[PDB]
Amino acid sequence: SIERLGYLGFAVKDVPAWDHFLTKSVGLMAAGSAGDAALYRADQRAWRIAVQPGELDDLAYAGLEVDDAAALERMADKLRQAGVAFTRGDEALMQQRKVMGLLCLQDPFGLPLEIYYGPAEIFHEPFLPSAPVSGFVTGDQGIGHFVRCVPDTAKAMAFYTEVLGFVLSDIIDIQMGPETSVPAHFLHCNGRHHTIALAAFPIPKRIHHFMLQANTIDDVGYAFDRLDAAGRITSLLGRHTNDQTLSFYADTPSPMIEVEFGWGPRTVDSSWTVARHSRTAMWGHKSVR
Amino acid sequence: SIERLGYLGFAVKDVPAWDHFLTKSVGLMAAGSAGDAALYRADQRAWRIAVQPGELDDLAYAGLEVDDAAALERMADKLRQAGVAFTRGDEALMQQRKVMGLLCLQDPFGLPLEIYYGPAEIFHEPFLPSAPVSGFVTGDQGIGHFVRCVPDTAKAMAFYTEVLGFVLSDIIDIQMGPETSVPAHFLHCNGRHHTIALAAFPIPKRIHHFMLQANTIDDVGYAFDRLDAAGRITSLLGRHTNDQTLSFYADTPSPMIEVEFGWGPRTVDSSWTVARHSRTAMWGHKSVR
Amino acid sequence: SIERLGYLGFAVKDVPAWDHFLTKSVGLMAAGSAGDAALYRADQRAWRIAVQPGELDDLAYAGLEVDDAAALERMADKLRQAGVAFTRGDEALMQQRKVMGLLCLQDPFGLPLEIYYGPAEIFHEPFLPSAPVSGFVTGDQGIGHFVRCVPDTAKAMAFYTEVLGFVLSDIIDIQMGPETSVPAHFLHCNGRHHTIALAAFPIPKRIHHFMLQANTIDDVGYAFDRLDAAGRITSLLGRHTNDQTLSFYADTPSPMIEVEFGWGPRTVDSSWTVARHSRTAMWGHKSVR
Amino acid sequence: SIERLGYLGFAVKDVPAWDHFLTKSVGLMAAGSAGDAALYRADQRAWRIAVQPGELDDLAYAGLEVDDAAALERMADKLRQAGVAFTRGDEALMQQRKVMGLLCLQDPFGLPLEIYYGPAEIFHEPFLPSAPVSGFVTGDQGIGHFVRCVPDTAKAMAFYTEVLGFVLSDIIDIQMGPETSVPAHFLHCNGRHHTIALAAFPIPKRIHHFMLQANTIDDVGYAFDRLDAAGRITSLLGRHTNDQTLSFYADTPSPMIEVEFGWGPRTVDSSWTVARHSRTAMWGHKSVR
Amino acid sequence: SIERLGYLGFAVKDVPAWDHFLTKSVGLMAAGSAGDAALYRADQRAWRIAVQPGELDDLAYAGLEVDDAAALERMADKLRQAGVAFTRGDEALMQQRKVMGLLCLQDPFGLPLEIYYGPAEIFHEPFLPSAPVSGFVTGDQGIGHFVRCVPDTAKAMAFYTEVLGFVLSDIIDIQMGPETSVPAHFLHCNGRHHTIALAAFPIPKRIHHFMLQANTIDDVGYAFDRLDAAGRITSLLGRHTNDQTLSFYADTPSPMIEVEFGWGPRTVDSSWTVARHSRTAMWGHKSVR
Amino acid sequence: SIERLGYLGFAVKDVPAWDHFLTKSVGLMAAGSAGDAALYRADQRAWRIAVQPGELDDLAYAGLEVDDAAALERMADKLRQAGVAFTRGDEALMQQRKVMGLLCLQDPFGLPLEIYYGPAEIFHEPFLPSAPVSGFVTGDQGIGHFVRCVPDTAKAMAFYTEVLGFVLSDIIDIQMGPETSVPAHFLHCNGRHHTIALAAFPIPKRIHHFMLQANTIDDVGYAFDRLDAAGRITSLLGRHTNDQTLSFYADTPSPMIEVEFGWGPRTVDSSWTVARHSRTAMWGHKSVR
Amino acid sequence: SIERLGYLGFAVKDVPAWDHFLTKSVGLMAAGSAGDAALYRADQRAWRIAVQPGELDDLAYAGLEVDDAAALERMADKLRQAGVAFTRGDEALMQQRKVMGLLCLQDPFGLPLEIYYGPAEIFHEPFLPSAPVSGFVTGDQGIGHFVRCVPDTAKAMAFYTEVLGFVLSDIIDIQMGPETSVPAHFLHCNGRHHTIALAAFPIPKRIHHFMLQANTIDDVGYAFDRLDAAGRITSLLGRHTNDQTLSFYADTPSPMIEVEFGWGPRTVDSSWTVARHSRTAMWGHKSVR
Ligand SMILES: [Fe+3]
Ligand SMILES: [Fe+3]
Ligand SMILES: [Fe+3]
Ligand SMILES: [Fe+3]
Ligand SMILES: [Fe+3]
Ligand SMILES: [Fe+3]
Ligand SMILES: [Fe+3]
């Protein structure tokens, strides 16, 4: 039912650091502000990522997109049936988010979620990257993906698949030591191999990282050098086993939250079949202190 | 309902002969062992063919793949309704087969079948053939196909189509003498013209042969020379009438069980129409003593 | 429900004339006989057109193909419900027609129809034309089409669409004089613009003509010269308004029954929309005495 | 050296007949006049065919195009060396023809030829056909071709190949009776199989016909019906043996001069090899009284 | 011999106006400075356009590129033979221009020209436009083109074609009033229809305008709005008759010098043929006060 | 200089055997006769292979094609300079061979060669195979190739390359026993890897075999079965190391002369580089008694 | 004149280390031995890289390939004219190298060079990598490239371009410190951006490294992990500025000699233009201790 991940809002301790990070390093286009939130663009949408001041230094909310008004009412019906509490966004919130309608709720573990429809687009103000990146792969696959940390993956799974409609792509057992392994579950709601992954990681954040997909391999290669100069690289270039995303990781100005910048992943369709992997790295991705 | 044939297990009298056969001749990649079974790879799956010691010198079991956990429960519901006895594989069997879940049963005539989901893949250990073969055509069409010998084709047909969901592609009347003919039934469960064929052959084996599809015609041409040097050729190159597979046959180290190595067959789809053929050979396939 | 027109049987006064006509002129491949009927091939099917001796000098029967055994039973259920009388072909008829099963019936006006499934194919005996023609367009679209003459087009239409499942493509008002016009109805049951057309023509035959589609335009150009030398041309080259078939017409050895040899027609699909035309000729098709 | 045939001028007894013929039937666009010559367009050139009053009722002149000023001087040098008399067109003639420079001469048998360069184009006045024709194939291959009647083909051949640079494509022996045959020589100077053909025909005209190439087969089919309604058809549709032009012929208002309207011919290149044909018709082209 | 136009240097009265113009409006990337000249990029070259202070408010020089050192010596030999005065650029000039070698000269009417080879590229500093433009079409066709004003077009033509190796593409008679027309000559030295055009215009500048080619039509559409907001539009969108460039014109901060921003022109090759046009506009290009 | 191998003439002891062989088995089209020679077609040429009665039971002559009359005179000049004796074919021979001109000579070891130009084509009589073969690959590459047996390969090489213009493709050392090897030299004169190969084989024939190239792999597969039924197979299917021709060999009715029927070889071009191979078989080609 | 780099021979202190390195790490196929040299394959050539015992621990020789025997004689003529000493390889050397002919010489600074023609190929023994690599890009571009260290780049340049025929692609100034830079010259002799580069590096080896090009990016990614496990990585993944090769570097068992494993470089052609770069890295290539 949820069609794609449309936007993300972060609450951070260092807004100037995040602004420079998202523009100069990542390459997003600065798009003014909405309230005390600075807006950033990656394409034709009026905004894709919002950054506001806050002690959380974590993801503040995530916008889940449906294709129309009826679809949003159908989501409200699903929440209602599942017994999930939610509130309809008032006019002010609709204006602030620039959407035609939205339902505000939370996943089982505190992450505020906003199901919305009718987002604002500004084709008369063509996207202009702040750094050398040819463009981002969004469109029907949404803004990208993120790894949601959860204390109970089974509980999280039930909510995301059963209530929100996400579908399991595959699982990767992430070695967390000699005799410790965490089964990460990758979920899709469209062509993107996964829009949200659930993992029971021993981390104090709502998410482990968010990912943006660039158009070319050079986009990623150039990006790595930009973030290396910032001294934020956390991983060498690599390619994932399940989605085949070729990428590198880097720290955001928010401690323990990373960003993944990749290219050329595999996409999913109806014929997709669930599989299991023992490693997240097909090759590369060597961790960097 | 069954999506594709994912794996095969053989119980044989000469394991060293089978190991050399599958690697040096066929070109499969040796992939360690699981219990007393030696594993072999043809692609990204952790294993595709298993070979263990046994007096049977025949196919020990066949793995039938579904796309997810729900699908496996739906298969269990079908078996239940059809009155087909089955057992859920315990943790140890799941570990041994490297699958997330599986149901163990038998076809009407003793062939152990395992319906499973969530197989293991190892992209961090890229497939490397043991002999010059560019690659195998698997993917959604599974590992290949095999001809199941049955005492009663009508009984077998009812089980495979009605209970397992296979669909009849076509029939070939195989001349078994001047006034003797056996109607072989070809069944598909995906794009592969046929994944399983049923034939009432006067042979003491569970199957007449199994087939692997290579990527190029040269793969087959080279393979024929490799198996000819082993003195195992049972047929000259040829092309089948129904699936248009261009191939040759050869003996495996297990008496009366052959292998077919082919290329470029026709694939099936929704618009497929059942037809009848009087010969299995479009051309070639001359039998070789 | 009927999938395509698979074969035609003619009962004629001059078999040697028809044999020469179909082979030397049309280019079909002579394929032996079945009973007192001479068989002719246009592709991989064991036969497509049968010609037997008879005073009728008309179409004796038409084979309507379905994709499988279940589909044939579903047709039997439709006939039953519609109150249409039919008989299951006995073993001998199945053998004679080389089909796995068939129902024998008649359209509202006497044309014997045979709904069948599982036709015989002989890929080991590759099609070889008897005259220079590169090949025929058959496959899923069947053998071609024919215009069925009927005394009551509304009655015929109800039977073919409501009972057999054909779908109206379009209508062409065929000027039959200064103040006389006959509305020809074109029906499809697959990709071929039309497999059967109904027209209330003042002709003593069951059909006005049958059509075969060649692979290239040169096939048609060469064919016209072949039939012109036979002195059988009834129309100059032309292109139809509705299906866009580029063709010419010629007399068969059976008085008042013609053959149409064409190329490159338009095909239909789900999005097709019913339309009306005042002429059958987009250009050409000038009638020739 | 001559690059392509760029234009033709006719001197005719019935200008109104020729105007209607070229526009309503052929489909050329009326483009005003130059002196007492009515101009017609087939593409971006200011004019392609000119028609002026005259008792000749034949081709008055032909424009042979070179790519630049230097090239024209090189042609003048060739004529000079070959001893061929010619005159440089004065300013008035350059203006009348709308060319930057031109040499006026005659072939060995009286046909006035004008070698020119720098023709006028009017892209701001897009070509608009006077009849339903999708467009003409001109460009680098020039306006089309024509068959030049000559009393001595060997003498004509020497001049056109040796002096003007045309190259022999092939020869077709045109049966002119039981024991009479005329060897027609086809010459090219670019991609068009032939731009000029020489034949010793017993006809009182400078040319037997001129040819225009349309973009689609329907263009030709529609054109045939248009000229048939005018009662000018001289040949049924057909396809030539040497250039593979699919076309039909028709009479122009000038007695004994025809027009050929075709499509899809074969083109020539460096690897072309001279061949001989016994017929001009691959198929069709049946002569019509 | 000259391979393409590689760079342009302007001497202007308002550098800050030119900097804003080239970046914010045109979209070029600011690339530091060289001496008192501000550098701008359009691709991988270290610089493409230089702007320095000066009363000229005109083009200061133009860089003509050859492919190697030998080629530059061959140009020196040509100048020498033609009696054209030139000087070899010293080390300092080579450093300032970032080229491996260069000859400094002037065209017959005072425009300083620099023939060079071995330009500097900086792929490690990816091009980043200063305004929304997807990219520019440069590569082998050079930076673009410009219209050189000359008092004597015949004298200019002799120098550019005979000494520098440019080739005439075509001519357009530009109506300069009721009975006044100026024949503009378009010259190419590569795939670009024209790199330099000569016209005897009554203007006090060395050039009438310079042109840049963008990758998409939207690039041009967006650019027009950007320059319209600057109030610099001199022409509405249009398409040229000869090169088929779809573009609009605008004033640069230098009085009487314009810029042309276009897309999708036709390219030239060996088979190109010289032609003449009476208008520069195929459509559009309406002049704007 | 020689452009391609255009035709072959055989002198044989059993003409009826050769006629059946070439038509029923190979698939060539019977094309009447010329003198006491029966003609056979493979495409649009009036004939490609001629068979006449004779005790030789070998190749009687080979036609080497040039593109025009001038080219033939240039060949005559080459023969003259090389001191090679030759005679111009009289009118009768030109008529018999259906060529516009030809020079008759012999290679250094007795094989009569005819260099010709202007061959006859009959597009009005479309090629119709006598057996199921989709078509042959001829065109610019000629009819195919043949292996010429010579007592002195160096002497043969000098003549074919130096006098006739053939170019060495590569060499294959053909093992003729434990310590015996024959270096076969492959020569091309166009795109066909080789048109003529020279080998010092201990065989009493002028040639070891001739080769024809079919359009599809099935053409070859079907052909093998046809020749196997004739009991003429001399080799199993295989693929050559140098030209990559996939084929099989068979005996012609002429003792010690074979035919090769293949598909999909590699073609040569200017960038081709001479190489050496130790085997003729990439795979297959197992000799059959 | 030299067509491509065909092979390399190394003289090393640790042959077992080199054997494991080239097979297990790089992925080359072990191909027996020739004398005391172990041979390795990368494609259809009998060998591409040879490794023999020696204190040099450097490149022992390089094979430069020409297309034929005449071409080799033309090279001998060039050496002769240039006054370069050389010796014709005797039969034994020809046998050892498996070439049809070769000239032995040295570049100006001691690197033994062997110009050869007619190399041996073994298509009957299909290439089989020793490690997971899909294949190498060789063919007309040869085996790859290498950086030749020279004390005098101008002297080296004169020899390689003037005597051997290599052509300068571009130059990269390699920063060798704060005020130290070495101008590396890249030379091509075919489509490969460069086959040999000259640089005045302060290194005691004949070459700095040799490069092999793989078919896919994953080939490189997998290769990096293989060499990292060997602890031989000297550089992180990166992409070069001039040839756009995406690669990583690693140490060979020979101290101070590295290997480069890359993918997807740009290729050169006639239109190539010499340029200059200040960095070798477009991105990545961070040096690793
Ligand atoms: Fe991720
Ligand atoms: Fe099989
Ligand atoms: Fe019809
Ligand atoms: Fe014509
Ligand atoms: Fe312009
Ligand atoms: Fe051969
Ligand atoms: Fe390198």
Side-chain angles (χ1 to χ4, degrees), chain A residues 123-124 126-132 222, chain E residues 123-124 126-132 222:
Chain A
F123 281 95
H124 68 282
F127 171 73
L128 183 66
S130 296
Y222 279 130
Chain E
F123 281 95
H124 68 282
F127 171 73
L128 183 66
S130 296
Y222 279 130

Side-chain angles (χ1 to χ4, degrees), chain C residues 123-133 222 226, chain F residues 123-133 222 226:
Chain C
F123 281 95
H124 68 282
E125 275 179 23
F127 171 73
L128 183 66
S130 296
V133 58
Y222 279 130
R226 285 203 300 276
Chain F
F123 281 95
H124 68 282
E125 275 179 23
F127 171 73
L128 183 66
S130 296
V133 58
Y222 279 130
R226 285 203 300 276

Side-chain angles (χ1 to χ4, degrees), chain B residues 221-237:
Chain B
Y222 279 130
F224 177 101
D225 276 10
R226 285 203 300 276
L227 278 160
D228 197 14
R232 318 187 92 87
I233 298 300
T234 51
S235 112
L236 296 190
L237 285 163

Side-chain angles (χ1 to χ4, degrees), chain A residues 145-147 186 194 197 208-211 240 243 245 247 249 260:
Chain A
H145 77 244
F146 72 85
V147 174
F186 300 79
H194 73 274
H208 166 274
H209 79 261
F210 67 102
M211 185 264 187
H240 287 293
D243 68 354
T245 286
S247 63
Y249 291 78
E260 176 186 18

Side-chain angles (χ1 to χ4, degrees), chain A residues 91-173:
Chain A
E91 193 56 41
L93 185 59
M94 284 184 281
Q95 277 304 140
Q96 159 78 206
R97 304 277 116 110
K98 301 190 223 284
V99 299
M100 291 192 229
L102 85 152
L103 317 170
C104 302
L105 67 145
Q106 292 184 170
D107 74 7
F109 307 103
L111 176 61
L113 295 175
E114 307 178 334
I115 304 172
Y116 74 92
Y117 96 95
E121 294 189 338
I122 48 174
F123 281 95
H124 68 282
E125 275 179 23
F127 171 73
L128 183 66
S130 296
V133 58
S134 82
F136 293 91
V137 172
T138 56
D140 199 57
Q141 293 176 77
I143 194 50
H145 77 244
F146 72 85
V147 174
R148 173 78 169 112
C149 298
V150 301
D152 181 335
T153 295
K155 208 176 153 201
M157 273 291 283
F159 168 89
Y160 278 98
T161 60
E162 298 180 31
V163 178
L164 293 192
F166 279 82
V167 180
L168 179 73
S169 278
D170 42 53
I171 293 156
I172 291 180
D173 293 304

Side-chain angles (χ1 to χ4, degrees), chain B residues 28-149:
Chain B
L28 301 192
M29 159 192 200
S33 67
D36 58 272
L39 307 180
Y40 302 87
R41 291 178 55 200
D43 57 7
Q44 88 287 163
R45 283 302 162 75
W47 70 279
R48 280 293 192 177
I49 283 181
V51 174
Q52 76 215 334
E55 283 302 296
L56 227 41
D57 244 1
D58 204 333
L59 179 67
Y61 53 91
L64 305 180
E65 187 177 305
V66 292
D67 293 330
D68 49 68
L72 192 76
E73 291 319 306
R74 239 143 47 215
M75 279 319 308
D77 285 348
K78 279 173 187 215
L79 294 183
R80 195 166 278 115
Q81 274 134 48
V84 183
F86 70 100
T87 303
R88 234 167 242 282
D90 58 28
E91 193 56 41
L93 185 59
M94 284 184 281
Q95 277 304 140
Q96 159 78 206
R97 304 277 116 110
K98 301 190 223 284
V99 299
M100 291 192 229
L102 85 152
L103 317 170
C104 302
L105 67 145
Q106 292 184 170
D107 74 7
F109 307 103
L111 176 61
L113 295 175
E114 307 178 334
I115 304 172
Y116 74 92
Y117 96 95
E121 294 189 338
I122 48 174
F123 281 95
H124 68 282
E125 275 179 23
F127 171 73
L128 183 66
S130 296
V133 58
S134 82
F136 293 91
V137 172
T138 56
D140 199 57
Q141 293 176 77
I143 194 50
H145 77 244
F146 72 85
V147 174
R148 173 78 169 112
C149 298

Side-chain angles (χ1 to χ4, degrees), chain F residues 191-215:
Chain F
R192 200 176 285 287
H193 173 264
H194 73 274
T195 288
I196 289 185
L198 309 163
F201 292 148
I203 157 187
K205 315 303 296 189
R206 293 193 168 143
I207 61 159
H208 166 274
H209 79 261
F210 67 102
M211 185 264 187
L212 288 181
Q213 194 185 146
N215 288 343

Side-chain angles (χ1 to χ4, degrees), chain E residues 130-210:
Chain E
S130 296
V133 58
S134 82
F136 293 91
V137 172
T138 56
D140 199 57
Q141 293 176 77
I143 194 50
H145 77 244
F146 72 85
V147 174
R148 173 78 169 112
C149 298
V150 301
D152 181 335
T153 295
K155 208 176 153 201
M157 273 291 283
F159 168 89
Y160 278 98
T161 60
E162 298 180 31
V163 178
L164 293 192
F166 279 82
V167 180
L168 179 73
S169 278
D170 42 53
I171 293 156
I172 291 180
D173 293 304
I174 293 153
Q175 215 55 230
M176 229 81 176
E179 270 242 270
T180 328
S181 204
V182 168
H185 299 236
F186 300 79
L187 318 169
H188 65 268
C189 59
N190 57 54
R192 200 176 285 287
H193 173 264
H194 73 274
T195 288
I196 289 185
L198 309 163
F201 292 148
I203 157 187
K205 315 303 296 189
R206 293 193 168 143
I207 61 159
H208 166 274
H209 79 261
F210 67 102

